[PDB]
Amino acid sequence: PPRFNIANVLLSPDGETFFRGFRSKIHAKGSLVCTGEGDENGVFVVVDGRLRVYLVGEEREISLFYLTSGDMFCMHSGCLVEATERTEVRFADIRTFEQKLQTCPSMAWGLIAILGRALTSCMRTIEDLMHH
Amino acid sequence: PPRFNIANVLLSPDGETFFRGFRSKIHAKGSLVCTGEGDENGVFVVVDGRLRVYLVGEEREISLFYLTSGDMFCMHSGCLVEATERTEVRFADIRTFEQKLQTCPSMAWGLIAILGRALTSCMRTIEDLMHH
Ligand code: HEM
Numbered sequence: 001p002p003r004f005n006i007a008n009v010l011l012s013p014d015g016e017t018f019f020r021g022f023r024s025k026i027h028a029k030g031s032l033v034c035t036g037e038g039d040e041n042g043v044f045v046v047v048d049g050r051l052r053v054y055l056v057g058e059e060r061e062i063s064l065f066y067l068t069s070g071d072m073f074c075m076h077s078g079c080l081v082e083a084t085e086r087t088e089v090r091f092a093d094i095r096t097f098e099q100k101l102q103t104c105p106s107m108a109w110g111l112i113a114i115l116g117r118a119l120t121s122c123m124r125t126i127e128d129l130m131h132h
Numbered sequence: 133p134p135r136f137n138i139a140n141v142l143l144s145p146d147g148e149t150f151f152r153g154f155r156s157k158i159h160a161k162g163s164l165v166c167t168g169e170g171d172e173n174g175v176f177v178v179v180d181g182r183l184r185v186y187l188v189g190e191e192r193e194i195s196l197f198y199l200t201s202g203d204m205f206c207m208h209s210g211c212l213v214e215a216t217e218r219t220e221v222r223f224a225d226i227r228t229f230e231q232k233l234q235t236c237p238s239m240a241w242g243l244i245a246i247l248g249r250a251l252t253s254c255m256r257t258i259e260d261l262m263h264h
């Protein structure tokens with residue numbers, strides 16, 4: 001998918017309200033936003049800071065990609081998410097987020113972009129796990 | 133991401149024409165739909181049939197997931213696609229797809245959906261490839 005700048009949405013009259021009322025949470029460096037389990041469910045967006053999305057297995061970590069400011073992710077991918085800096089997120093449950101999306105579909109490309117990014121990573125990862 | 137039913141859109145007045153003008157092509161069981169080094173850019177949607185998506189290196193094919201009636205995909209994922217049965221597709225180029233998307237945002241959910249499954253499939257592939 002194309003790149004996506006979240007600001008073309010937030011600066012626009014359709015977008016500016018998108019996160020109104022989303023709760024705010026701060027994540028200490030080193031802290032786990034998500035474990036591959038029952039964190040809960042919900043979507044969040046990185047306000048500032050930086051998070052690492054990775055997998056394990058054989059007790060070994062594979063980095064997939066990083067989530068910096070403006071990036072959207074969820075609590076249910078089954079990936080691990082840990083803060084590498086103190087980072088702030090806005091969050092809401094799946095349902096509120098769905099609502100907002102249908103009222104401002106242009107903001108759906110951000111979701112498209114983050115899946116594209118996480119997809120290309122995994123694929124490149126897979127190529128590399130084979131070249132040995 | 134949420135599951136997507138393309139009929140919801142195609143039956144909507146909003147989206148009934150979405151594939152107007154797309155061209156039709158028939159691939160016979162066994163034929164390659166995508167290479168890596170083909171360098172043609174485009175989107176297609178499966179009308180009927182079944183395609184397999186996989187990657188290759190070191191002469192080891194690895195299957196990721198499959199595409200069936202209603203699923204969308206592209207010619208630039210670097211992924212390799214072969215028809216496991218007689219499969220009819222509709223296609224156009226990225227530009228034309230974009231336009232149709234601008235005009236009918238609800239259809240982007242099918243993009244979110246296919247990127248979505250691709251993601252989950254590649255992850256287990258990784259989870260798998262490691263207990264190995
Ligand atoms: C329909 C299913 C699609 C899939 C599975 C997909 C997947 C991908 C992947 C894996 C890449 C990584 C490029 C690489 O391997 O080097 C990519 C790049 C790209 N794709 Fe898509 N894509 C899809 C649809 C689209 C659409 C609809 C558009 C445009 C409207 C698009 C435009 C682009 C662009 C511009 C890039 C390069 C992004 C960059 O600058 O890094 N793709 N896509």
Ligand code: HEM
Pocket residue numbers: 043072073074076077078094097098111114115118133134135248251252
């Ligand atoms: C924002 C980035 C997101 C990513 C990377 C993502 C990824 C995933 C993954 C990997 C799964 C399967 C988990 C498993 O392996 O069991 C899943 C399931 C699911 N997610 Fe998401 N998701 C995202 C956002 C969303 C959003 C915005 C919604 C809104 C409805 C949503 C709703 C669902 C639903 C309903 C399922 C299970 C239903 C099905 O079988 O497709 N997710 N998602």
